Fold this sequence. Notes:
This protein is an alpha/beta fold. The protein has helices at residues 11-16, 32-40, 53-58, 74-87, 103-107, 117-127, 133-144, 166-169, 171-174, 210-219; strands at 4-7, 25-29, 44-47, 66-69, 93-96, 113-115, 149-154, 178-184, 187-190, 203-208. It folds into 3 domains: 1-116, NAD(P)-binding Rossmann-like Domain (Rossmann fold); 117-146, Single alpha-helices involved in coiled-coils or other helix-helix interfaces (Up-down Bundle), CATH 1.20.5.870; 147-223, Alpha-Beta Plaits. It is built from 10 helices and 10 strands. The strands form 2 sheets. It has a 6-stranded parallel sheet with strand order 3-2-1-4-5-6, sandwiched between helices. It has a 4-stranded antiparallel sheet with strand order 7-10-8-9. One of its GO terms (biological process) is potassium ion transport.
Amino acid sequence: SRHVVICGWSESTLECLRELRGSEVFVLAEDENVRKKVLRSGANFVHGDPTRVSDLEKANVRGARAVIVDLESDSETIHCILGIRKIDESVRIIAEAERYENIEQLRMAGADQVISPFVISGRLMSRSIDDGYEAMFVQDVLAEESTRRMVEVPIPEGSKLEGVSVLDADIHDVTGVIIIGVGRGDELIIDPPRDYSFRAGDIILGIGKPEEIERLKNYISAL
Length: 223
Ligand SMILES: [Ba+2]
Ligand SMILES: [Ba+2]
Ligand SMILES: [Ba+2]
Ligand SMILES: [Ba+2]
């Protein structure tokens, strides 16, 4: 119920374990060099072929909290996702796509969230030739968290901000957090209009220093 299955092993999935409890994580892989590394990392190892439905079942993908898929090829990545969806239609699947062409192929396979790090890396490479300021921000906010970080803060039922305009909310002046967007119902609205009214269940996506984030957390609370 709480457990997370990881199909494949890479520096990404390793970094994924940084923020996850390790005894809740089952890593599904065939290779024995991977087994040593998984155990060394304090996570659980399940021997099998992630492109095989039989082994996917054995990994208890059925009731999983989420399944993370990064395999050696976008081909294997796509086949693993297809196999999961034969087992559980509703299970949350997060997958890493290597080639841009295949991002949409991962979605049509049932990936709930796709991440394409080579596409991101490549853009930043070419764009950092003449001006490196976009890359500096990405490194600080999305990687190292030197100063600030992105944050998703949910809006509770008893929230003082319910129904309030984003202009009247003035989240930047109060909190200090730059508001990127607000999502709900698996739909992300970026840079909402001034007349936008907050609803409960809405999630606020923003960027800010640690203190600025606590103030945003504080600002959204019981009436
Ligand atoms: Ba890969
Ligand atoms: Ba091969
Ligand atoms: Ba320059
Ligand atoms: Ba850190």
